[PDB]
């Protein structure tokens, strides 16, 4: 009956123990800030907002920490092709995405370490972990060793195998030696660059400890982002380093994956000239995270019907509100629609513990709505107890999904 | 830890499992409506509201039903004082009743039985007691037998032999024979009016089923209107009628019990007019429910000083947050604002999971409001996501014990 999570470390749904009694320590992948955000970014961090709800939901403390990579190889490309400073943009889209975000009713999350402020510690870890023999010097830069860690391959299930200045194909760059025009920090070893997957391990380190529980990202980031993390973390510590692994599904539209690459990405902004965010938020929470997502214009047409159906019947309940009175007894039909709040919030929660299901969430949801429109359709005088019963079905589903905020704040 | 309630049926703090999953039926037992209501009911109804709000905040789906006596031999006695018609009486005291509780923010329950409105259940649970055998009709009325029923005195541990037309001492009246001049009903056995005791167990069988999981009133209620309601039900249905018994401690004027026999009781208007529903709220709180509460205008002072305190905590958090930034870093004052926070909460829901420990909750909120007004007094730019968890945790608190309405109403 409790919370389970389908961990992708075993591929399995399992009971969901924190390591400190009462509270989460989540970390999710940031988005690199060279372009607006799209589809893709919406539905991760919307499905993380949405995990981060519940949990808080139930009683435990969440602290959610997200990078913000504002230094990389297709940043200094895009400063190039605009003729701006690796920097100034970096801020400037760090700033876009906020605001995206925050548009989109997405809890911000408590700590946003930056890459350019945590050189240092990034330092540091790389010579740990040459000096535990994990990291060798080559000619351009620190490239980490990957046969020196047995378990690579945990996550992702890829052989070492399949795989086959760097000494090994497989290996990847801890530390890049600065090209001339672009960016760069002093280091015992040249100055340089961080790879793209130290920043994580090291922001994750410094601020949530050496083991945390949940580690979050996209589908694509399983191969070879999120396994360079937990290799570079359990070569550094040796031990366990995330408990739990998350990962939200693709974005699909027509078929094949949604990227900037192919050029098929649409922007929160313009999806916004369109839709609410609310509408938006319903879209996403109409799948299982970890299920792909196709992007159809029909598919958010459908999502705003929807929403606004649950509008409706909130609207519905407003007014009858007004003239509802107290109930010195109950009859069949106050019984029956009673029965029916009762098992969809038991059903909402049933589905929200297993693998935060908001599918099925939202068919209890539904099934409320219709039962509470059905009542107002046929009781003659309506009670004040059902009520407010159903608004506080409601007021739980607002909380957790993120939606009727505007009702509710009235 | 599971939550824990303390049975006085077995005397002793039990793990609260309730019959069906996801709902809790509770019932109160409600006013006798001849007079104002005085801080005794005051602090049993806000005490049982305050459970509801902790049932509810846990996910239970919480059915409470309050029966209203509005026909009673002292309403009688009232009414023939007055000079006015009981039920015109009973109805304008119950209107009275309804507004306090809703001065008093206490959410009113699901449904309100009226006896005048359950004659018939009431002769067909005592036709129902006599042709089992459990009772006989006397020369002014029906009585209930006592010896028939072996397990009378469990809840109370009065036994039989201490209390020795009616047969025994020890029995009570089912159906009292209309003297002349007072409302009456007709019944097989002759005009009349129920007792005092039947009413409850006939209008709980009826609303939350053939057994549901709390019951609840006073303490003055363990013997005999309790005792007999067991007893009765018991009786009838052969079987457990109420898993938890929860009975709130009685309210002490200079030492002595607060009743309305010794002219010593304070009306809930008179308060009103001298504190805010929030102060009193607070000031009931500051006790557990079982234990005996001291009224006394220093106690009040002293609850409206603290209810002032958190007031501030809120309104600097408040204007904290106008010019609170996001935070790319935290130091080691934010870390510690965020681990007293989260252990805060953690208290908080062990105190309440401990018996609706209101006394020790309080006090993890007020250690709570200090290390947040300690943060803002040193912090020199306050992080958004500190003061954002605090006020969460302050949510859950207004949730849970009604306080703060204003604050995160606006
Ligand atoms: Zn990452
Ligand atoms: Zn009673």
């Given at each position: 009956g409790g919370l389970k999570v389908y961990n992708t470390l075993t591929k399995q749904k399992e009971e969901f123990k924190p390591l400190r009694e009462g509270e989460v320590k989540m970390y999710v992948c940031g988005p690199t800030v060279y372009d607006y955000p799209h589809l893709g970014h919406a539905r991760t961090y919307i499905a993380f907002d949405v995990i981060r709800r519940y949990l808080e939901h139930k009683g435990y403390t969440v602290l959610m920490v997200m990078?913000?990579?504002?230094?990389?190889?297709?940043?200094?490309?895009?400063?190039?092709?605009?003729?701006?400073?690796?920097?100034?943009?970096?801020?400037?889209?760090?700033?876009?995405?906020?605001?995206?975000?925050?548009?989109?009713?997405?809890?911000?999350?408590?700590?946003?370490?930056?890459?350019?402020?945590?050189?240092?510690?990034?330092?540091?870890?790389?010579?740990?972990?040459?000096?535990?023999?994990?990291?060798?010097?080559?000619?351009?830069?620190?490239?980490?060793?990957?046969?020196?860690?047995?378990?690579?391959?945990?996550?992702?299930?890829?052989?070492?195998?399949?795989?086959?200045?760097?000494?090994?194909?497989?290996?990847?760059?801890?530390?890049?030696?600065?090209?001339?025009?672009?960016?760069?920090?002093?280091?015992?070893?040249?100055?340089?660059?961080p790879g793209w997957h130290i920043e994580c391990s090291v922001m994750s380190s410094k601020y949530l400890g050496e083991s945390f529980d949940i580690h979050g990202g996209g589908?694509?980031?399983?191969?070879?982002?999120?396994?360079?993390?937990?290799?570079?973390?359990?070569?550094?510590?040796?031990?366990?380093?995330?408990?739990?692994?998350?990962?939200?599904?693709?974005?699909?539209?027509?078929?094949?994956?949604?990227?900037?690459?192919?050029?098929?990405?649409?922007?929160?902004?313009?999806?916004?000239?369109?839709?609410?965010?609310?509408?938006?938020?319903?879209?996403?929470?109409?799948?299982?995270?970890?299920?792909?997502?196709?992007?159809?214009?029909?598919?958010?047409?459908?999502?705003?019907?929807?929403?606004?159906?649950?509008?409706?019947?909130?609207?519905?309940?407003?007014?009858?509100?007004?003239?509802?009175?107290?109930?010195?007894?109950?009859?069949?039909l106050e019984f029956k629609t009673y029965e029916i709040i009762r098992e969809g919030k038991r059903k909402f929660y049933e589905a929200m513990d297993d693998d935060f299901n908001t599918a099925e969430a939202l068919k209890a949801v539904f099934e409320v709505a219709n039962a509470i429109n059905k009542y107002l359709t046929e009781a003659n005088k309506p009670k004040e107890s059902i009520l407010r019963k159903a608004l506080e079905f409601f007021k739980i589903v607002s909380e957790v999904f993120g939606v009727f905020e505007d009702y509710f704040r009235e």
């Amino acid at each position: 009956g409790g919370l389970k999570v389908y961990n992708t470390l075993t591929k399995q749904k399992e009971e969901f123990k924190p390591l400190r009694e009462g509270e989460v320590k989540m970390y999710v992948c940031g988005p690199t800030v060279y372009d607006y955000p799209h589809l893709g970014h919406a539905r991760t961090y919307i499905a993380f907002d949405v995990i981060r709800r519940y949990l808080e939901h139930k009683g435990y403390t969440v602290l959610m920490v997200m990078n913000f990579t504002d230094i990389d190889d297709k940043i200094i490309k895009r400063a190039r092709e605009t003729g701006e400073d690796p920097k100034e943009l970096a801020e400037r889209f760090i700033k876009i995405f906020l605001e995206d975000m925050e548009a989109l009713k997405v809890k911000p999350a408590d700590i946003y370490p930056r890459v350019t402020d945590h050189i240092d510690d990034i330092i540091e870890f790389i010579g740990k972990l040459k000096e535990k023999g994990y990291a060798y010097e080559g000619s351009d830069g620190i490239y980490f060793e990957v046969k020196k860690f047995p378990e690579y391959g945990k996550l992702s299930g890829v052989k070492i195998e399949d795989l086959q200045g760097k000494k090994n194909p497989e290996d990847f760059a801890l530390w890049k030696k600065a090209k001339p025009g672009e960016p760069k920090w002093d280091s015992p070893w040249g100055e340089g660059r961080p790879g793209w997957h130290i920043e994580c391990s090291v922001m994750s380190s410094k601020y949530l400890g050496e083991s945390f529980d949940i580690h979050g990202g996209g589908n694509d980031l399983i191969f070879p982002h999120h396994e360079n993390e937990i290799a570079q973390s359990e070569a550094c510590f040796g031990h366990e380093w995330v408990k739990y692994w998350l990962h939200t599904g693709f974005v699909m539209v027509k078929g094949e994956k949604m990227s900037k690459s192919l050029g098929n990405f649409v922007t929160i902004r313009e999806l916004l000239k369109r839709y609410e965010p609310e509408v938006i938020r319903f879209f996403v929470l109409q799948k299982h995270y970890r299920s792909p997502l196709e992007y159809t214009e029909e598919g958010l047409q459908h999502a705003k019907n929807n929403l606004q159906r649950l509008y409706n019947t909130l609207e519905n309940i407003r007014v009858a509100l007004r003239n509802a009175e107290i109930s010195y007894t109950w009859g069949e039909l106050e019984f029956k629609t009673y029965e029916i709040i009762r098992e969809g919030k038991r059903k909402f929660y049933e589905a929200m513990d297993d693998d935060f299901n908001t599918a099925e969430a939202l068919k209890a949801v539904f099934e409320v709505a219709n039962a509470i429109n059905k009542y107002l359709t046929e009781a003659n005088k309506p009670k004040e107890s059902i009520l407010r019963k159903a608004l506080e079905f409601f007021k739980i589903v607002s909380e957790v999904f993120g939606v009727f905020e505007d009702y509710f704040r009235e």
